[PDB]
Design a protein around this ligand. Structure first.
Ligand SMILES: [Zn+2]
Ligand SMILES: [Zn+2]
Ligand SMILES: [Zn+2]
Lengths: 89, 513
């Protein structure tokens, strides 16, 4: 051949079993609102109902784990202190 | 020359009064002499014209500044107008420097000039004003007032620090590097809107760590120390977590290579270098791109995906293309090219069959829209005499039916020639600026809500505008209060539980969970 690849420097991103189809706290989805918001509008009045990403690569609705912080303080699928490293998908 | 003359007059008057008159003899004499001379010359001699205060400061006359400071210090309200005029000159210079009208300014040069001006003013202060507190306060206030005039000032500071950190070709030794870093952090001290600064610093960290390594290997840590001491125990810890994640990635990559060497079954896996990162630390590039991966690379990635889905059962190895690089071995000698994971698919298609066009690479490739054209022009359009992908229809604009060819280009004097079309002159185009502005707006939106839900759970309640002052004071060192944004966002939480903050019954808030 005329051109051949010798080295590769790909970067691999990983995500845990967040279950994009069932929120691990509310069991609706990784998007499309939550149990306490339901309808899309539901008198939104600004604020937000996006996805929250932790330091453990877990994803839930911001509302779900914001409320869950009052029940416990360690991400339910593990035993790690939950951070708020990202907001939204 | 008037200041020297009046100083001599004061000296001779005090000498005469202390030698030719009574023992004390000096309080009313010196008071009235000052009130006549300085209190009348103060208003007009420093601002009118013909080498007053602004002109004697612009040219850099240290002795004039020192003697003016030592003379006007005796009379009250002299330092006040001195600092007022100095602040006016500083505002004029900043407006002349922070001017936004006109495109084509180098951010690194702009930050270098601003830091040079700051260092010059600091040197003048130290040499003449004897480190007076009033002058320092006035210059700090002037810097705070004039620096936040533009919203791309922290971005330009981040670009300057990235340029200084990528390679220490200027100032090889450590003393000048330490001094310039101290000056840079001092300049950053009198700056607002720290959120965009942190965001762009993290983006620069991602750019400098996901590219060729061995940039400083110790000055990066010096800079983390500086930011920790300045910004605080906040996001410098998150950058340390990012560095720990990078360490995990490299230690696991070499371990997996060693395990594959023992197996002796790594076919597509040759001299590979796979980095494992976490979603939270590094933002997704645009939309996680996808396209036909060259055969050998594809196999390597599939084996690595098996390794991650089995040992760390759960790690979803998502494929992407807007990151990384590669070394393409071409072949009169064997010169190795370089592809930044963008031209690999197009060149592989060329290897499979030459004489292709835009339609061929847009039909049997399933490649994103614009990042494809960016790589296509990085390969052919606007390329110096090192062309690795030539075309017959020589034109600036990109057509559809254009055939692609290859050239020798013996100008490369080595076997490792790279095409660094990316990371060009800082253009900071409108779409990327708008999207990062929206991202930082959402960042502020969560930053205010997290603070209000973390603080107010252990605090008192507000009636109309009590707790908003506290929440703005807590974020005073972060960014602007944005009263309308916080007012519109605090009233959205009433729709559900956990401190609904009832508007009509604004007398007692639910202190529950
Ligand atoms: Zn949920
Ligand atoms: Zn919700
Ligand atoms: Zn977790």
């Amino acid at each position: 051949k005329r051109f051949e690849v010798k080295k590769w420097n790909a970067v691999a991103l990983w995500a845990w079993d967040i279950v994009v189809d069932n929120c691990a706290i509310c069991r609706n989805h990784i998007m499309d609102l939550c149990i306490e918001c339901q309808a899309n509008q539901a008198s939104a009045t600004s604020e937000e109902c996006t996805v929250a990403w932790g330091v453990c690569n877990h994803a839930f609705h911001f509302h779900c784990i914001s409320r869950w912080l009052k029940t416990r303080q360690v991400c339910p699928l593990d035993n790690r202190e939950w951070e708020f490293q990202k907001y939204g998908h | 020359v008037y200041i020297k003359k009046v100083e001599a007059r004061i000296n001779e008057e005090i000498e005469r009064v202390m030698h030719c008159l009574d023992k004390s003899t000096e309080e009313p004499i010196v008071k009235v002499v000052e009130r006549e001379l300085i209190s009348k010359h103060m208003k007009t001699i420093v601002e009118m014209e013909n080498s007053g205060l602004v002109h004697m400061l612009k040219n850099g006359k240290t002795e004039d500044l020192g003697c003016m400071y030592k003379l006007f210090s005796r009379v009250p309200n002299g330092l006040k107008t001195m600092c007022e005029c100095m602040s006016s000159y500083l505002r004029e210079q900043g407006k002349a420097l922070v001017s936004e009208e006109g495109e084509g300014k180098n951010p690194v040069d702009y930050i270098q000039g601003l830091l040079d001006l700051k260092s010059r003013f600091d040197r003048f202060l130290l040499e003449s004003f004897n480190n007076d507190r009033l002058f320092k306060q006035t210059i700090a206030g002037d810097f705070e007032y004039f620096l936040n005039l533009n919203s791309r000032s922290p971005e330009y500071l981040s670009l300057f620090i990235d340029d200084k950190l990528k390679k220490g070709v200027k100032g090889l030794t450590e003393q000048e590097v330490e001094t310039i870093l101290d000056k840079a952090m001092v300049l950053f001290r009198f700056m607002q809107e720290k959120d965009v600064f942190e965001r762009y610093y993290k983006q620069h960290l991602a750019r400098r760590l996901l590219t060729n390594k061995s940039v400083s290997d110790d000055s990066e840590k010096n800079m983390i120390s500086k930011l920790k001491t300045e910004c605080g125990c906040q996001f410098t810890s998150k950058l340390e977590g990012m560095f720990r994640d990078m360490s995990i990635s490299n230690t696991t990559m070499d371990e997996f290579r060693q395990h594959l060497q023992a197996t002796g079954v790594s076919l597509g896996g040759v001299d590979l270098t796979v980095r494992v990162l976490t979603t939270g630390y590094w933002p997704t590039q645009s939309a996680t791109p996808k396209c036909n991966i060259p055969p050998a690379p594809r196999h390597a990635f599939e084996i690595f995906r098996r390794f991650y889905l089995a040992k760390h059962s759960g790690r979803q190895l998502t494929l992407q293309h807007h990151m990384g690089s590669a070394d393409l071995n071409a072949t009169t000698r064997k010169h190795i090219l370089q592809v930044s994971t963008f031209q690999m698919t197009i060149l592989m298609l060329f290897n499979n069959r030459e004489k292709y066009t835009f339609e061929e690479i847009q039909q049997e490739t399933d490649i994103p829209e614009r990042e494809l054209v960016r790589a296509l022009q990085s390969l052919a359009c606007g390329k110096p005499t090192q062309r690795v992908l030539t075309k017959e229809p020589k034109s600036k604009e990109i057509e559809n039916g254009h055939i692609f060819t290859v050239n020798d280009q013996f100008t490369s004097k080595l076997h490792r020639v790279k095409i660094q079309t990316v990371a060009a002159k800082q253009g900071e185009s409108d779409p990327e600026r708008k999207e990062t502005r929206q991202k930082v707006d959402d960042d502020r939106k969560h930053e205010i809500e997290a603070a209000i839900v973390r603080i107010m759970k252990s605090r008192k309640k507000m009636q109309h505008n009590v707790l908003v002052a506290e929440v703005t004071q807590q974020l005073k060192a972060r960014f602007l209060p944005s009263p309308v944004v916080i007012k519109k966002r605090i009233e959205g939480l009433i729709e559900r539980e956990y401190l609904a903050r009832t508007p009509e019954d604004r007398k007692v808030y639910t202190y529950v969970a």
